[PDB]
Structures are given as C-alpha cells and as structure tokens.
C-alpha cells in the first residue's frame, strides 16, 4: 500500500524522464529541420514550425495519457488492498471485543489499527481528488458526487464500526481518552 506508491512514484518518475526525453530529440530534430529549410521558401518555412508544434503537441498529449492511465490502475489496486487491509483489521477488533475477559488494550491496539485503515483510505482517496480539483477544476467536478459518497460511506462504516465499543462500556471507558487522540 506503501509499497505500490514507492511503486507509483517510480513509474511516475520513469514516465516524467521519458516525456522530457522524447520532448528534447524533437526540439533536437526541430533545429535540423531549421538548419536543413535554410535554403527552402518562406511558404515551406512557416510550415515547418506548424510541423512541430502539432509533434510537440501530440507528445503532450501522450504524456498526458500515460499519466492518467497510471493514475487509473493505481487507484484500482490501492483501493483493493486497502479494503483487504481494512476487511482483516476489522475481523481482529471484533475478535478482540468478543475476548473472555475483554482485554482493554489488546481492543485498543486492534481498534487503532482498524481507524488507520479507515483513515488511510479516507487520506488516500481525498488526496487524489484533491489533486485533479487543483489542477482540472471542471474534471473534478465530474467525479466529485462519485467520490463524495465515497467518503460518506468510509465514515459511516468507521463509526458505526466504533459504536460497537459500546457493547462493552467497561473497556470502552478504560480506552476513551486514547481512542479520542485517536480520532485527533
Ligand atoms: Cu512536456
Ligand atoms: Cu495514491
């Protein structure tokens, strides 16, 4: 989850070099094609800039692309895990809160790592939105309604899951005040 963002940053660097990459051999072919429609008319001349910066204009473009599909499968496989994580968090603080006797900090320890969960893909699913609202308001706007159900459903599911602390008051007293700096 942490590995597949090491994991995304890297394709994301590799994807930056190749764009800046193929972008330099086509300013490099431009200056050829300057150098060689030295002795070619004005006419041949002014469409030689058009040329390129219709190639320029299709790098960006794919670059563009690229970045938007690697973005795709990365929300894919990060919401996978992260469900899986949660799903297997959830199932140890159940676990722990049906204990005979109840053992207040193994809850707690198993109730932290089920709000991370929870709080990870919250983070990790407003960040990315955040990010196309910051550089494509109107896209954003797009999935906006799709992503904000998103959100409700991740903290309806934490606190109806946290709620369930209830159902043993004597733990759940003896853990309040950490559970708040928890939740803080
Ligand atoms: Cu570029
Ligand atoms: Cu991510």
């Known amino acids: 989850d942490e590995n597949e963002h090491a994991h995304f940053q890297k394709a994301k660097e590799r994807l930056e070099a190749k764009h800046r990459e193929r972008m330099s051999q086509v300013m490099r072919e431009w200056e050829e094609a300057?150098?060689?429609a030295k002795n070619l008319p004005k006419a041949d001349k002014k469409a030689v800039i058009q040329h390129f910066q219709e190639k320029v204009e299709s790098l960006e473009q794919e670059a563009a692309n690229e970045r938007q599909q690697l973005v795709e499968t990365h929300m894919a496989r990060v919401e996978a895990m992260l469900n899986d994580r949660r799903r297997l968090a959830l199932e140890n603080y159940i676990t722990a809160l049906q204990a005979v006797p109840p053992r207040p900090r193994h809850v707690f320890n198993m109730l932290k790592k089920y709000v991370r969960a929870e709080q990870k893909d919250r983070q990790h699913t407003l960040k990315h939105f955040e990010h196309v609202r910051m550089v494509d308001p109107k896209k954003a706007a797009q999935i906006r309604?799709?992503?904000?159900?998103?959100?409700?459903?991740?903290?309806?599911?934490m606190n109806?899951?946290?709620?369930?602390?209830?159902?043993?008051?004597?733990?759940?007293?003896e853990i309040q005040d950490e559970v708040d700096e928890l939740l803080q």
């Open 145 to 157: 309604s799709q992503v904000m159900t998103h959100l409700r459903v991740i903290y309806e599911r």
């Open 160 to 173: 109806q899951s946290l709620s369930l602390l209830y159902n043993v008051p004597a733990v759940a007293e």
């Open 34 to 36: 300057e150098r060689q």
